[PDB]
Amino acid sequence: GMKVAVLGAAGGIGQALALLLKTQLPSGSELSLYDIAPVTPGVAVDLSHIPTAVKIKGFSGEDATPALEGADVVLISAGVARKPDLFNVNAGIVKNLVQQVAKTCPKACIGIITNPVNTTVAIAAEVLKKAGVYDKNKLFGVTTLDIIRSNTFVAELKGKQPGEVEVPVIGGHSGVTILPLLSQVPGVSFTEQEVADLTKRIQNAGTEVVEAKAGGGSATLSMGQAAARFGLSLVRALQGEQGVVECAYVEGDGQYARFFSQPLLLGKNGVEERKSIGTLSAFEQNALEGMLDTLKKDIALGEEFVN
Amino acid sequence: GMKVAVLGAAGGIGQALALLLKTQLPSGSELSLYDIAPVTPGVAVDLSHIPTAVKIKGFSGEDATPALEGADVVLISAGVALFNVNAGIVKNLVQQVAKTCPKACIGIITNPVNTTVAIAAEVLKKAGVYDKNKLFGVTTLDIIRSNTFVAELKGKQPGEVEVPVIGGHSGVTILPLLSQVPGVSFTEQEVADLTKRIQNAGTEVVEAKAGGGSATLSMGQAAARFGLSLVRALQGEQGVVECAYVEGDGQYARFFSQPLLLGKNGVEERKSIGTLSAFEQNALEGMLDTLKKDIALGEEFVN
Incomplete structure (x- = not known):
């Protein structure tokens, strides 16, 4: 089945996203949640009690690899949320996560939600290029x-x-x-x-x-x-x-x-x-x-x- | 043209509930959010940017009346997700329901439901507006x-x-x-x-x-x-x-x-x-x- 990974799933954006995906993804899909915060496996257990045909598991810590294995779509919402300096905090977060995508699911479609999108998508592209796996048709700024x-x-x-x-x-x-x-x-x-x-x-x-x-x-x-x-x-x-x-x-x-x-x-x-x-x-x-x-x-x- | 009020809308349960109702209520519905948390007007503005035909407004302070005016359904998810904290909150909010939309259906989400529904019923009975067909523990x-x-x-x-x-x-x-x-x-x-x-x-x-x-x-x-x-x-x-x-x-x-x-x-x-x-x-x-x-x-x- 189609597998979607959400990186940044413990934040307000990620939890709302995960709830909507658990309830709207097609039957047979799989959803993996990752964030640093140790609450993340339990965010997935919470959502796992909703009776839809979407398998869901969550992961925490420093390594996103187990959430990324077999992923077809990776949505990256980690980092600090925009409140209208942001580059200063989120640039390294995006670079770290896209490096893990490049190693584990390089053929996935990647949706960058983390802001500032105009800049963070360029970071992602150059990371993927350095890893030799960049596909311009698969990288999106949301x-x-x-x-x-x-x-x-x-x-x-x-x-x-x-x-x-x-x-x-x-x-x-x-x-x-x-x-x-x-x-x-x-x-x-x-x-x-x-x-x-x-x-x-x-x-x-x-x-x-x-x-x-x-x-x-x-x-x-x-x-x-x-x-x-x-x-x-x-x-x-x-x-x-x-x-x-x-x-x-x-x-x-x-x-x-x-x-x-x-x-x-x-x-x-x-x-x-x-x-x-x-x-x-x-x-x-x-x-x-x-x-x-x-x-x-x-x-x-x-x-x-x-x- | 049904109107749903969510009391406790700023908590984790309340925001998830509000997001789902904003996206799933029938076109022409109204949704009001109330919570003592000062963020609540902006929780509603956040949801108001989603393009569904559901009018949404949020309210804070001590007065739930503007959220409850004309409400057909009141969902109470306020309080801690213990008994003495939530008991007083349920009593307070059900008093406001009794005075503003006494013919609404009331769904108590606030736990412990086995007890908080009994609190709600006794509040409504004291006010003289109780309808046991309209009070639900969710x-x-x-x-x-x-x-x-x-x-x-x-x-x-x-x-x-x-x-x-x-x-x-x-x-x-x-x-x-x-x-x-x-x-x-x-x-x-x-x-x-x-x-x-x-x-x-x-x-x-x-x-x-x-x-x-x-x-x-x-x-x-x-x-x-x-x-x-x-x-x-x-x-x-x-x-x-x-x-x-x-x-x-x-x-x-x-x-x-x-x-x-x-x-x-x-x-x-x-x-x-x-x-x-x-x-x-x-x-x-x-x-x-x-x-x-x-x-x-x-x-x-x-x-």
């Missing part, structure tokens, strides 16, 4: 939280059903690199003021969470849901479902930057097709040009950490 | 554990196994009716071993967590299953059956968990526990005194 936020905010503004709205989001995963393509939402039109306001809201949405928590936490549950949506889409594609499309941050043709988020057709090899970003409005063209320097610097930060 | 975790363990032992698909569980929610008061699992027979030894495992399954989790926590995610899932079943029945679905701990006819104890047909006013019919095996009959007789003491503890706390 940007899905930007998409599900965009869907929610567009649906609310325009009175649509939220589950029926799908906004393409391109670029990167932080600040001005997040570009929602509002001009492409079918059946919906936006004034230029609505576009500027919605784009700013999407680019700063995590601050709504932090402020409403009075500084006491981050957006853990919606990040778990976004990561679960991405992981479940990847599993559906790896099992042969057709037409599975997700935006994610991947190494592409390099037209805008070495790594860039765009709509992807997924398949049994990971990325099946990098789809065109399409026709952009004047606002979107300016936003795209405006964040290229930032995105390239984010990428170089990760490349230079390894090399 | 025992669903015992059922989904039983389903998991039976399916593994017998090589069944876990989602196709449903085990009735009767009695109470702790220790020897948990009685899984393995004799009633359709298409499956168990040896005497299998019954003994499965019953012991089900009665002590929480300790499995505590020990595997190296003493660093309790069952939170499976309790969230069990509470979500119960809450979603209740919402379905309140919206007119026929044939929705769940085991839960309720004030019934008193044949065995004042409060007792048995299969319930749910409906538009909460309990529609308290179903018979059926025919019991010799093992099940002895287990039922053996825990009645414990269950009655659990109930009296809750009654005395209020009275």
